[PDB]
Each structure stands twice: as C-alpha cells, then as structure tokens.
C-alpha cells in the first residue's frame, strides 16, 4: 500500500496498556501463582504467551476470571515476565535467571527462553 | 534498572492484537458510525484515542457493549483510523485526508492530527 507509519505507535500503545494495568483499569483476569495474585488484560497475555493464547481461545476457559498456574511456577519469575509483557523490559539477574527461564518455557515466550539460554551459556 | 529490552516486543504485541481483531477474538465493544459497525478491543481504543480513554474510564460507559459516534463522523475515516490503531500504518490519501483529520480530531489522536495538518499545508 501507500501507507505512512508512526514509528513510536506500538511502544506508545504498550506504555498506555501498562498505565491501565497499574491503575487496574479494564483488567479482566486474575492469574494465581501459589499464594500470589496478578491482575492483567487477557488480550495482552495472549499477545505475549503461547500458553495464554491457547487458554483464552478455548471456548470454556475464555470465560474464566481466574486462572491457576502449575504449582511449580515461581511467583517472582511470573512477576518479571508479566512486567516484560507490558514493557518490553526484562529484569534478568543471576539470582532469578533459572526461575525466569522455567516460567518463560511454561508460558511459551520463545524470545525470553532464547535470551535466558544465551545468558546461561555465557556463564558456564 | 539493569533490565534488557526486546526491540521488536511492542510491534509483535500490536501485530498479535490485530490478529485477534481480524478473527474477532475477545473483542468487547461495537463502535457504530452511522450505518456501519466496527468491532474492537476497549483497551486498544483507549490506548490510541483520548476520546475512547475518557469514554471507557467513565463508571457508566465502561460497561456499554455499543458506542454510537457523532453522526458527522465518516465511516471510512473511522475505518482508516481503526486500522492505524492496530497497525501503526495510516492510509492517508488526497481523497480521504479531510475525513481522516476530522475523525482524528474528534477521537483525540494528536499525532494523526499533526501529520494531516502538515500534509494539507504542503498541498496549499
């Protein structure tokens, strides 16, 4: 086509979605990770995770307001990944890399799994 | 912080949100523009438009499944802007620039209004 493109549009959209998340505006699901609860937008979770995409396209699960993750999932690893979904920034540290990679594999977040594998390979 | 950032994340999120829109997945509102209807995600509309942000943060309007726009709004101008919201691409043409600018002013989409004003100033 003969379209023009606004370079910063996608980043500005995501920044605004994160602002809605921070103020708990139009969040439509709670993700339960052991004793912790994380409120989010189903659409953002689906856009970032192969697991959430599969969950919310299921005709029964699409209507659930609460999703319980596998008990092996670490709440901090999930929190770091939820922040990444809404910001593009990943808080990857020596102390959390194993939990983050395990959570990203479960959530089916391929680019996160890839950088974790590379950071682990560099430290061996 | 000591975060790393995935450059393409915001663009990939928006691409996936547009894929959900195309398949009518988790769309939660109909925007009525005269005889036409446009299905969308409230969160994406709020992230792109000062008007939708104000509408869906209102305690009564946040719960509406149908929003009727002012009858002066052109359905094609709205369609072009809805596509821009989900893609960052604006189909701006000599034949539609006036309707697009008028719709972007009503929707409170400042960057779109700015490029329309510049394209109009160049042709005078």
């Amino acid at each position: 086509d003969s379209c023009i493109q606004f370079t910063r549009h996608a980043s500005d959209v995501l920044l605004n979605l994160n602002r809605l998340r921070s103020r708990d505006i139009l969040t439509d699901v709670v993700i339960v990770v052991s004793r912790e609860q994380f409120r989010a937008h189903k659409t953002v979770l689906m856009a970032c995770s192969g697991l959430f995409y599969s969950i919310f396209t299921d005709q029964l699960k699409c209507n659930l307001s609460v999703i319980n993750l596998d008990p092996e999932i670490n709440p901090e690893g999930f929190c770091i990944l939820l922040d990444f979904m809404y910001t593009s920034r990943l808080n990857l540290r020596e102390g959390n890399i194993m939990a983050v990679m395990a959570t990203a594999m479960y959530l089916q977040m391929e680019h996160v799994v890839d950088t974790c594998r590379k950071f682990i390979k560099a430290s061996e | 912080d000591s975060c790393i950032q995935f450059t393409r994340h915001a663009s990939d999120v928006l691409l996936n949100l547009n894929r959900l829109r195309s398949r009518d997945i988790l769309t939660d509102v109909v925007i009525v523009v005269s005889r036409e209807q446009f299905r969308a995600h409230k969160t994406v509309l709020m992230a792109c438009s000062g008007l939708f942000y104000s509408i869906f943060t209102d305690q009564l309007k946040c719960n509406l499944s149908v929003i009727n726009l002012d009858p002066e709004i052109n359905p094609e101008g709205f369609c072009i802007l809805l596509d821009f919201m989900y893609t960052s691409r604006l189909n701006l043409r000599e034949g539609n620039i006036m309707a697009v600018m008028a719709t972007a002013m009503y929707l409170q989409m400042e960057h779109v209004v700015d490029t329309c004003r510049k394209f109009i100033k160049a042709s005078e």
Binding site: C3, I4, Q5, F6, T7 | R89, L90, H111, T115
Partner: peptide, 4 residues
C-alpha cells in the same frame, strides 16, 4: 512518520 516514515515510509514503511
């Protein structure tokens, strides 16, 4: 704005 750019030509994509």
């Amino acid at each position: 704005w750019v030509i994509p």
